[PDB]
Amino acid sequence: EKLFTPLKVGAVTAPNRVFMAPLTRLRSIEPGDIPTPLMGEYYRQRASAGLIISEATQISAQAKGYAGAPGLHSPEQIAAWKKITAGVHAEDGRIAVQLWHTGRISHSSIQPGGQAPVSASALNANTRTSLRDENGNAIRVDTTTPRALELDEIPGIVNDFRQAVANAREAGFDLVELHSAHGYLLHQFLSPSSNQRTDQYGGSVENRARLVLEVVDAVCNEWSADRIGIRVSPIGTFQNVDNGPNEEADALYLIEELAKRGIAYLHMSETDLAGGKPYSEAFRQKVRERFHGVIIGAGAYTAEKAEDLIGKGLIDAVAFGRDYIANPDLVARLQKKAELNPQRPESFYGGGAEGYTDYPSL
Numbered sequence: 001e002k003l004f005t006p007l008k009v010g011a012v013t014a015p016n017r018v019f020m021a022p023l024t025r026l027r028s029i030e031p032g033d034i035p036t037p038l039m040g041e042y043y044r045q046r047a048s049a050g051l052i053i054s055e056a057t058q059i060s061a062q063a064k065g066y067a068g069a070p071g072l073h074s075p076e077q078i079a080a081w082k083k084i085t086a087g088v089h090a091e092d093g094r095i096a097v098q099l100w101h102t103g104r105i106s107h108s109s110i111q112p113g114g115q116a117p118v119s120a121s122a123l124n125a126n127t128r129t130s131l132r133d134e135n136g137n138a139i140r141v142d143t144t145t146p147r148a149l150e151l152d153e154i155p156g157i158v159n160d161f162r163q164a165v166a167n168a169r170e171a172g173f174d175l176v177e178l179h180s181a182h183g184y185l186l187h188q189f190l191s192p193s194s195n196q197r198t199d200q201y202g203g204s205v206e207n208r209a210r211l212v213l214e215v216v217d218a219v220c221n222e223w224s225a226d227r228i229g230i231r232v233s234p235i236g237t238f239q240n241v242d243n244g245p246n247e248e249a250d251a252l253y254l255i256e257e258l259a260k261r262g263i264a265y266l267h268m269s270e271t272d273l274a275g276g277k278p279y280s281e282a283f284r285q286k287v288r289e290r291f292h293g294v295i296i297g298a299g300a301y302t303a304e305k306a307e308d309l310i311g312k313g314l315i316d317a318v319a320f321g322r323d324y325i326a327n328p329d330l331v332a333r334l335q336k337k338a339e340l341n342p343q344r345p346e347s348f349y350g351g352g353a354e355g356y357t358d359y360p361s362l
């Protein structure tokens with residue numbers, strides 16, 4: 001078994017390769033999109049993870065697409081996250097913040113000024129996001145048609161990611177994970193399906209990857225390359241965003257570019273909850289020979305699959321999502337071959353302590 005051996009992940013050393021995937025739980029305070037002590041307790045309970053990757057967190061107010069998702073742009077958010085990371089560190093854990101802009105997976109009612117959300121192009125996501133009703137409960141609502149960003153708005157987006165990374169470093173996070181997956185803003189630019197621009201940010205794969213690479217360069221300069229990870233979902237379809245007609249070649253282009261920056265890790269989200277075709281071993285080999293940081297695999301993994309791929313030299317770590325919702329001590333359970341707590345999906349999104357901090361350890 002290799003799952004319980006250490007791994008250098010850029011600037012930090014994980015004691016095991018069982019990571020907690022980023023999980024939106026929609027329990028932040030509104031107004032202000034403020035993280036809470038309850039959230040702090042949830043993360044503290046999971047501090048034995050080799051690395052905790054936080055729920056997706058807004059880089060700016062404009063970034064918001066879900067009611068109850070936290071930000072990392074305001075003083076009050078910074079102050080609240082400081083307490084949370086301190087708690088994780090007091091339990092000898094490590095925590096990365098996943099930073100997003102939701103782009104078109106959003107709703108005008110939660111945007112600044114009540115305006116349409118922004119994207120690469122003015123194309124509706126044709127999916128739903130999660131808002132809150134008058135009683136504060138999560139509700140699924142159709143996404144608002146976005147406004148295409150003007151060319152002169154692009155530098156501001158890059159700066160928002162940079163600023164959020166400055167704030168993250170101050171807030172005590174050990175690493176940052178850029179959310180370049182799942183049909184959110186960075187992926188909206190990457191994918192031909194959502195990007196019909198005819199300027200330097202659309203068309204060719206070079207142009208489609210331009211924004212994400214500008215963001216990577218800006219955040220490496222703000223902090224250090226060994227503090228930066230990125231999550232991609234570059235094969236298949238996620239929330240109606242496919243990866244275009246040349247998905248493998250386009251993915252390898254992006255990955256070779258990322259490798260040049262010497263970033264800490266590449267986190268590949270391989271499938272959504274409905275599943276689909278597995279990654280080919282040939283594709284995994286092509287990724288591995290191009291990227292010289294840590295590779296994290298995710299998407300309906302088992303410990304046995306993680307061991308197999310780690311043993312084959314193709315990935316370095318695995319991120320578990322739903323098993324981490326339900327098992328604060330997932331590391332110990334996998335080490336001991338113990339049963340896993342029964343998941344309660346009705347309390348994944350919104351609410352309070354129930355279905356959040358009440359799953360027991362062994």
Ligand SMILES: Cc1cc2nc3c(=O)[nH]c(=O)nc-3n(C[C@H](O)[C@H](O)[C@H](O)COP(=O)(O)O)c2cc1C
Nearest residue numbers: 021022023024055056298299300301320321322348
């Ligand atoms: C409730 C829930 C929230 C999620 N939130 C995020 C998120 O904030 N960021 C992200 O990149 N993926 C998110 N995902 C995807 C998970 O990180 C993970 O990739 C997915 O659950 C598949 O892995 P699993 O089979 O181990 O759960 C979420 C998944 C679930 C079930």
Ligand SMILES: O=[N+]([O-])/C=C/c1ccc(O)cc1
Nearest residue numbers: 024056066129130181182349
């Ligand atoms: O259902 N939700 O409210 C959120 C889901 C979600 C958020 C981020 C992500 O990368 C995937 C799913």
